[model samples]
Target: MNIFEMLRIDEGLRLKIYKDTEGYYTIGIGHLLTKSPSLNAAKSELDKAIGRNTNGVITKDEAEKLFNQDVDAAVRGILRNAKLKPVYDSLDAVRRAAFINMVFQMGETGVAGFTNSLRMLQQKRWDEAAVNLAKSRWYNQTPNRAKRVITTFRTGTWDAYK
Candidate 1:
């Protein structure tokens, strides 16, 4: 599957406002609306995007649009990082999507903090990279998703999508 399809499954779509695991007010495909500085401003942007007064609901199309934008931001964030840009470019398509998925969940900085794991990945040490990933707080917080991503990194295949 493509990165978008993979992310849709990983993030799960929500047309209505909901509290994420971290208790943040989020909508669309894990879009943290609260990041807008104020709930009022967040609501206004959501309303404006859907072209109506959506009491807290959004259309699938609007959600998809937001998902795309968020994914774009994640990609740009990774590419903008001096260290990660080269590592990202060195990866294959499948491994690249796995990295993007990581950046999608945890910002570029978060993934960048995995210094040892990044070093292993940069050197193409797949097993070591996967092992390092398994030893993270992120893995403890989201084992299943982290497992899929780690496996993708180890194998460089679309097995995670299955």
Candidate 2:
């Protein structure tokens, strides 16, 4: 028998978005939503998975596992997503991590939507890239997150906005 039939792999791979017990949006196994979470929202599973400040439903080690897996997957996808390789490679570690984090939050398609930002990044125009990123629809959705990324891109340092 094929591995799929013998192991019932397909049955375990749920692709549709749905609310978990925590009422957070999730899809494709355990991928959490990219939509901006409300400031006062109750966060548990999804927040834990992404390593936010709030309490995590899982143990610290468990949360690390999910974050590592998701970040690694997003990093790998940068190569496959097109034109991001040069841009990604050009940046410092912090900047690269910011891009990877965005990819984790938005996926390749969503990251691809920042065409002007990516182009500016690829051309080694750090300031322009940072500005372009701030001007995007993503910025409108997640202003704090967008600012963090833009600042990282601009300064090559990972500093969260207060």
Candidate 3:
């Protein structure tokens, strides 16, 4: 056991994107819309979680840093009380992470609605779990993103889908 081992294993977050929160454009750590950019070509957002706003690109490395911090807190705080503790404690790193990642996107209440899928995971039914994930409203709203998570859960590879 090492200091970074836990985070390294379980922080399954996504790339930077402008997540809309009640019309506010957001980025890293679910950071909110604060600055308004002037680049029409780059309209929409800047990852203000870095302490400033700019239309300049958000590198994956930067987002990963923010993701680790954000998700670490989420797991220790929000998820501990999410009613997922039993199932969470039962999973291997990868599958446990998928639930946490989905919980981050939807609330714990939302992710918990996947009763059958969580059961499949707890029972170690890999393929069925993947198929179950694809059948959700989350998958319908975000197919490619869903593909990445489902494939990762199914195959146990950390590579992002391309």
Top lDDT model: 1
Residue 129 lDDT in candidate 3: 91
Poorest 10 consecutive residues of model 3 by lDDT?
A: 1-10
Q: Tell me each candidate's TM-score.
A: 0.91, 0.63, 0.60
Which candidate, 2 or 3, would have the higher TM-score against the true structure? 2
lDDT per model, in order? 0.87, 0.61, 0.60
Predicted model with the maximum TM-score: 1
Say what the RMSD of model 3 is.
6.6
In candidate 2, position 136 carries an lDDT of 69
lDDT, candidate 3, residue 14?
33
lDDT of 3: 0.60
Query: Please, what are the lDDT tens digits per residue for candidate 3 over residues 1-162?
Result: 221333333333334445353334445445333434434322343433555564544666776676677667657753476457777887777666666666665667787778898788778788999998888778887676677678767876556532
Superposition error at 50 for model 3 (Å): 9.3
Off by over 4 Å in 2: 1-60
Q: Is candidate 1 or candidate 3 better by TM-score?
A: 1
Candidate order, TM-score descending: 1, 2, 3
- lDDT of each residue in 1-162, candidate 1, tens digit only: 989989888889898887777666788998877654466777877787667899888889889888988999999988899978988999999999999999988888888899999999999999988988899899998898899899999999988779
Candidate 3: misplaced stretches above 4 Å?
1-24, 29-69, 77-79, 160-162
